[PDB]
Design a protein around this ligand. Structure first.
Ligand SMILES: *[C@@H]1O[C@H](CO)[C@@H](O)[C@H](O)[C@H]1NC(C)=O
Ligand SMILES: *[C@@H]1O[C@H](CO)[C@@H](O)[C@H](O)[C@H]1NC(C)=O
Lengths: 663, 50, 116, 235
């Protein structure tokens, strides 16, 4: 209800994108300068209100509860006749701020282009409609943008956070009374080509800083963060940031990795963990080319009065030490199981040094070989993993459960697991076991060839699975010694974050089929960690890397399905009256969302039924299928792009042939 | 009140955050949230109320 | 109180109220999954009284001389829990003789009836 | 029969009252032929001596059509295990010939393919018997019937702390107090199709009677139609 007299002025800034000039001083950076970004000013534009160092290019955060009227005086100090246009506010044409063929009056057009050096009071009366609703977090996220040039203004700047919160929770400063802190997150692909000055700026920008040069962030422990994740960019850009060590809530859904695209504004929650700096980055391949390195320091502040609510159980019900001995071991492998290359690796080599047809591909991967003997010599885990490739063994990890991981490295390189989307839980706390964490408290020993050490993994009562989720949520894991080349190698695995009750580590609810994994991951063997020995020593070509190629950059790259190429996978088959509980994982560098489809048969999505499910990179998808149509049917893809086109599994359906019952 | 039935059909990640000039959407579901715009996710069918 | 040495009387005072179901296991630690019907048990009993002060009949309770001394799963009415196929429709339709060996039924010198 | 209402005279003819040594129904009975009665194989653990008083309409008093029939022998499934929750079915060959009359007409097997394609694919199903009139209410004095709807497989799986096998299917209401109860031990539960009721199964177990979030754990009749026939011809 309060009358918000806001004073903001656009102004070109010779932005450095560096956190500070450093001891070298000066500003010799990318030629992205004179960036017109509006900044908040004192009442009557006495002077520009100071901006956060983290909010380098980020503009004035404009929180607003319902009922307010915002007297946004915009002195267009930038020398261009400009405008500012909101997105989701039912405004009036006098403060429309958007010029088009609305056939309106000049008084309702002056907003659409305000003269430079001229104050325009962009007034908008907020309403209860323009505010968070029921089942809605206490704040909502929006954007006001320069409608003068929706193409060039963004790259030239003119960006500012827009937030709308409920009454009561909103403070005078804009924080939530229920939230210890509020955090705003932004990414951009700032290009000087479509800017005021012209340059070929492929340089990527997290907030105001380039390719992972953020000044680090310090957050006290047990701090209720009301996050504000904003992803905007000119073209279609995916921002697949994983909160390493944190799980966030979006629309009553809990996920550790926050995958977003351009023009995405989001808010979430987290109560800050115990201790240790952390880094978050986008899983997009181009965001891997760039930094997007937002270092955040989770710190156990004594000046925080760590609540220690201890509203928990802390007891061995639902618990067991669950010693998963998944010691890493170098293996030979074939992407195509042309022969029935199933039943793990008993007859290992069996090869001919030929990348095609029979064994001889010699894709010398390094499996997470499961064991139960302490010495890890005998495999001791040889399950009925028929028609299964290099796949991490499933851990039916119930809520708040505990489990032990011990690695012995039977491979030429040091290795150590990264639980992605599982690290959100309190990890094995380390004070002497910091290892090569990168100062991010990632207890990553990178176990040397033949070395052995232990993981003490245990999750607390908070879980990714939720009533607005599935019984078990799919979260994978992989290595850390070299993400790109080792994912290109055979270093990947997966478990389940289970809210399940009747499982006992045996089966989530052993009444529906539990076939789960669909991993159309793309592996380039000319990108693998064992590129050298695999490609060179054990192929039908000389010992060159052969990146340059007719198609060997394309031959050695392949969108295999769970370690098996699509062309050499046998058809599925099940009998009727069955429900198949799936836990998918779209992890491959698809660069294009894929839409699977079941002929006749349909999916489930909470209550919704899909029958055609789109997929997103590096995300686990756990649903069931009501297989209700007899005969063979297609696990086909509707995108059907020639890149990953031959993806259709002829899963059969018959009326359960076995008559059983003895006679 | 008018119901939305905007759809997207596979293709190649053709996403579109449909801006509305002074309009606010409404989620139609078990939660019934309110939206400003929506990214047109390929392979997905979206229904809302306006 | 007065009268019999050891007779007990309760001072007039108020008392609080508590709830039990809201707690899960705690230091209990018995199982990881859930199961409600179909369980068998055999063990001993720990007493709270001095054996010299109670004599015979102290550490033998909670059982039956016929049904539980032999430690055998017994007939229909107790089968409701133990039968895995049965949890709601057992309905033995009768309560035969001796199903409550530890229940008392009083008479008075008044016409035959139970007061309390 | 939690809630529900009485079977009208003749509405539930195959329904039988398995009278035990005290001649009070310890189980729900199902007339199968002139010499056969159907009950769940759990009923075999509850018997000293027992007969079949077909045509009974009131446990209070004899009110017409009550003919006492004696079970010749029980066809218990050899794979019948309580832990499996499965094969809880006991065909009761009778010494006394069943006299097809008022309130005496059995339920016979349809086509197995048609039964699978039609019976378990129906919407609701009708359960009858001298059952507990409520979740714990007193046993139905009259022969009371009730109708319950089908439940999806996943709903039954989440609604049960135990296995929901390839055969067993939930049927009832999420929170409404109406279902089979104590008194429907092997109590015939049927499903209408053109006035020809088809026994789609009988509750075996479950948490309470029509409890909140709970359902009757019925047995897929279509699953063992071949075994039902082979036990019809057995003993
Ligand atoms: C804060 O996290 C808690 C965890 O249970 C959750 O209840 C709440 O919804 C979160 N807040 C927001 C705004 O998501
Ligand atoms: C810096 O940004 C450029 C933009 O293309 C990228 O290629 C490069 O890898 C980035 N460097 C780091 C260290 O993130």
């Amino acid at each position: 209800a309060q009358l918000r007299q806001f004073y903001v002025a656009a102004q070109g800034i010779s932005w450095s994108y560096r956190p500070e000039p450093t001891n070298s001083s000066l500003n010799l950076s990318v030629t992205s300068f004179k960036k017109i970004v509006y900044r908040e000013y004192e009442p009557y534009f006495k002077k520009e209100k100071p901006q956060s160092t983290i909010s380098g290019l980020l503009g004035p955060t404009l929180y607003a509860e319902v009922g307010d009227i915002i007297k946004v005086h915009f002195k267009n100090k930038a020398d261009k006749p400009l405008s500012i246009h909101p997105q989701g506010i039912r405004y009036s044409k006098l403060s429309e701020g958007a010029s088009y063929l609305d056939h309106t009056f000049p008084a309702e057009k002056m907003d659409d282009a305000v003269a430079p050096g001229r104050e325009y009071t962009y007034e908008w009366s907020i309403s209860e409609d323009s505010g968070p609703t029921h089942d809605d977090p206490p704040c909502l996220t929006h954007i006001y943008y320069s409608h003068e040039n929706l193409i060039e203004d963004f790259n030239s700047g003119l960006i500012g956070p827009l937030l709308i919160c409920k009454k009561g929770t909103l403070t005078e400063g804009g924080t939530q009374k229920t939230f210890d802190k509020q955090i705003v997150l932004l990414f951009a692909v700032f290009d000087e080509s479509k800017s005021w000055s012209q340059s070929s700026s492929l340089m990527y920008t997290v907030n105001g800083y380039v390719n992972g040069t953020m000044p680090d962030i310090t957050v006290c422990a047990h701090d209720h963060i009301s996050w504000h994740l904003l992803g905007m960019s000119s073209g279609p850009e995916l921002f697949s940031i994983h909160f390493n060590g944190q799980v966030l809530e979006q629309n009553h859904h809990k996920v550790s990795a926050i995958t977003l695209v351009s023009a995405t504004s989001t808010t979430a929650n987290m109560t800050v963990g115990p201790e240790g700096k952390w880094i978050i980055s986008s899983l997009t391949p181009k965001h891997l080319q760039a930094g997007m390195q937002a270092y955040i320091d989770i710190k156990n502040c004594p000046k925080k009065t760590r609540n220690l609510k201890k509203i928990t159980r802390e007891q061995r019900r639902h618990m067991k030490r669950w010693e998963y001995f998944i010691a890493a071991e170098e293996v030979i492998w074939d992407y195509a199981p042309v022969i029935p290359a199933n039943m793990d690796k008993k007859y290992r080599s069996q090869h001919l040094d030929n990348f095609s047809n029979q064994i001889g591909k010699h894709y010398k991967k390094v499996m997470y070989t499961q064991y139960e003997d302490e010495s890890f010599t005998k495999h001791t885990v040889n399950p009925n993993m028929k028609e299964d490739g290099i796949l991490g063994p499933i851990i039916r990890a119930q809520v708040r459960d505990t489990l032990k991981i011990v690695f012995k490295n039977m491979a030429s390189r040091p290795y150590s697991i990264y639980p992605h989307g599982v690290t959100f839980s309190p990890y094995e706390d380390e004070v002497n076991s910091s290892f090569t964490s990168g100062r991010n408290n990632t207890m990553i020993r990178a176990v040397q060839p033949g070395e052995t050490y232990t993981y003490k993994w245990n999750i607390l009562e908070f879980d990714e699975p939720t009533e607005n989720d599935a019984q078990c949520l799919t979260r994978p894991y992989y290595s850390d010694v070299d993400i790109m080349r080792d994912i290109a190698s055979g270093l990947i695995g997966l478990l389940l974050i289970c809210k399940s009750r009747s499982l006992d580590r045996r089966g989530i609810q052993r009444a529906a089929d539990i076939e789960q994994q669909a991993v159309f991951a793309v592996f380039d063997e000319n990108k693998s960690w064992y590129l050298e020995d695999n490609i060179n020593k054990f192929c039908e070509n000389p010992d060159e890397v052969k990146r340059d190629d007719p198609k060997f950059y394309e031959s050695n790259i392949m969108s295999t399905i769970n370690g098996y190429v699509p062309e050499s996978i046998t058809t599925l088959g099940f009998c009727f009256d069955d429900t198949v509980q799936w836990h998918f994982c779209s992890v491959g560098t698809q660069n294009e969302i894929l839409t699977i489809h079941f002929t006749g048969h349909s999916f489930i999505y909470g209550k919704r039924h899909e029958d055609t499910l789109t997929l997103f990179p590096m995300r686990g998808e756990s649903v069931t299928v009501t297989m209700d149509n007899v005969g063979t049917w297609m696990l086909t893809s509707m995108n059907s792009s020639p890149r990953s086109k031959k993806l259709r599994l002829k899963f059969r359906d018959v009326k359960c042939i076995p008559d059983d019952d003895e006679d | 009140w008018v119901r939305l039935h905007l759809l997207n059909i596979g293709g190649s990640q053709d996403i579109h955050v449909v801006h509305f000039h002074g309009q606010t959407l409404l989620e139609n579901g078990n939660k019934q949230h309110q939206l400003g715009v929506w990214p047109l996710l390929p392979g997905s069918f979206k229904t809302l109320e306006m | 109180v007065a009268g019999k040495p050891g007779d007990f009387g309760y001072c007039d005072l108020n008392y609080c109220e508590e709830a039990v179901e809201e707690e899960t296991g705690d230091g209990l630690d018995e199982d990881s999954d859930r199961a409600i019907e179909g369980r068998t048990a055999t063990s001993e009993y720990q007493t709270f009284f001095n054996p010299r002060t109670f004599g015979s009949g102290e550490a033998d309770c909670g059982l039956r001389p016929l049904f539980e001394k032999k430690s055998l799963e017994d007939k229909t009415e107790r089968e409701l829990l133990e039968s895995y196929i049965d949890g709601r429709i057992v309905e033995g339709s009768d309560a035969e003789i001796g199903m409550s060996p530890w229940q008392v039924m009083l008479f008075r010198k008044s016409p035959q009836e139970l007061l309390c | 029969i939690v809630g529900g209402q009485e079977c009208k005279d003749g509405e539930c003819p195959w329904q039988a009252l398995l009278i035990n040594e005290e001649n009070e129904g310890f189980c729900g009975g199902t007339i199968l032929s002139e010499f056969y009665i159907l009950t769940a194989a759990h009923c075999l653990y509850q018997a000293k001596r027992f007969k079949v008083r077909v045509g009974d309409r009131n446990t209070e008093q004899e009110e017409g059509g009550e003919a006492v029939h004696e079970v010749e022998v029980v066809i218990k499934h050899n794979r019948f295990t309580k832990e499996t929750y499965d094969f809880d079915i006991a065909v009761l060959r009778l010494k006394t010939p069943i006299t097809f009359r008022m309130n005496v007409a059995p339920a016979c097997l349809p086509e197995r393919d048609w039964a699978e394609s039609t019976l378990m694919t129906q919407k609701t199903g009708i359960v009858s018997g001298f059952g507990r009139t409520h979740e714990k209410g007193r046993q139905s004095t009259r022969l009371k019937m009730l109708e319950v709807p089908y439940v999806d497989r996943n709903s039954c799986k989440l609604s049960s702390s135990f296995i929901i096998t390839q055969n067993m299917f939930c049927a009832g209401y999420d929170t409404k107090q109406e279902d089979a109860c104590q008194g429907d031990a092997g109590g015939p539960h049927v499903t209408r199709f053109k006035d020809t009721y088809f026994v789609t199964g009988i509750v075996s177990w479950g948490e309470g009677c029509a409890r909140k979030g709970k359902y009757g754990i019925y047995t897929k009749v279509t699953a063992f139609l071949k075994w039902i026939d082979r036990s019809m011809k057995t003993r």
